[PDB]
Symmetry: C3
Subunit: 101 residues, 3 copies
């Protein structure tokens, strides 16, 4: 297994394209996105991104960039969870996530 | 970053309003909720609530489980999380950027 | 609270039933599944979340999925630590 930061961005659904381009520009190998309801009926349409990154620094770069650009004007939260990747074509590399020395 | 518990509640879809009410009264600052499928394929909902303290997450869990989970299907779990940004969650003092 | 492993499988929509069958055959007590988008242009996929009591049960599911499918289909499998606070089946009759 390969350690990973699971970066989660939940924000207003209109920022989808802007945030995807920030993720693409970061070096992250990919991302998962989904529609969600958020309260912060009072529920509104949100989007949640989940981005597994190899380093804490890459996660922080993405978080920082989204927040500095958008979080004055739009509701959102960004957090990280620890994760381990077991299988992942691009995340772990050709030798997979359980490489030996 | 500010330590948080990510409280997850997966349950029957018909409980959405009832559980949102509990989360609202808890002092939690917000929540996410989404339609999901599940087997325990049924129509489910999943709530995600970040809480500042483990006690808040446990009180919400306790309230929901006692009120509904002997009569309806449901699972409640927590993940550790660190909040980097969150205007309401971290408040004015920010997400302790240098802690 | 009862420690748990949260196994997450993101993969192609067509494998929904096939992966569900593998999760069940593993002894896992349940799973959640949802429609997602991903890049890895955004395309439609699915995400499974499976809480397991043991790490080996999570890796058994993971191994069986990846060997059977990840040469031919897009996907990622990862695990997060979790604790279950309430669950009928996960914790048994005496609760978590
Ligand atoms: N404590 C929280 N737990 C979960 N989601 C939250 C929380 N606070 C805010 N959010 C999410 O992010 C938005 C709130 O943004 P903000 O008020 O700028 O933190 C809402 O749409 C929620 O979906
Ligand atoms: N072991 C598990 N892993 C992930 N989700 C679960 C698990 N057990 C139950 N669930 C979810 O919670 C719902 C209610 O569970 P249950 O009360 O066991 O029928 C299910 O329909 C699933 O979506
Ligand atoms: N680093 C990552 N973080 C989050 N999700 C990912 C990542 N890499 C891949 N995925 C998800 O897994 C799916 C298939 O990935 P791939 O097989 O690598 O193209 C993508 O469409 C994403 O939903």
């Amino acid at each position: 297994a390969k350690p990973a930061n699971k970066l989660v961005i939940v924000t207003e659904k209109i920022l989808l394209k802007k945030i995807a381009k920030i993720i693409d520009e970061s070096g992250a190998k990919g991302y998962t996105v989904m529609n969600t309801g958020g309260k912060g009926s009072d529920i509104e349409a949100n989007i949640k991104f989940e981005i597994l990154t190899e380093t804490r620094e890459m996660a922080e770069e993405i978080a920082d960039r989204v927040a500095v650009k958008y979080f004055n004007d739009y509701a959102g939260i960004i957090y990280i969870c620890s994760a381990e990747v077991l299988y992942g074509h691009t995340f772990c590399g050709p030798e997979g996530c359980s490489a030996w020395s």
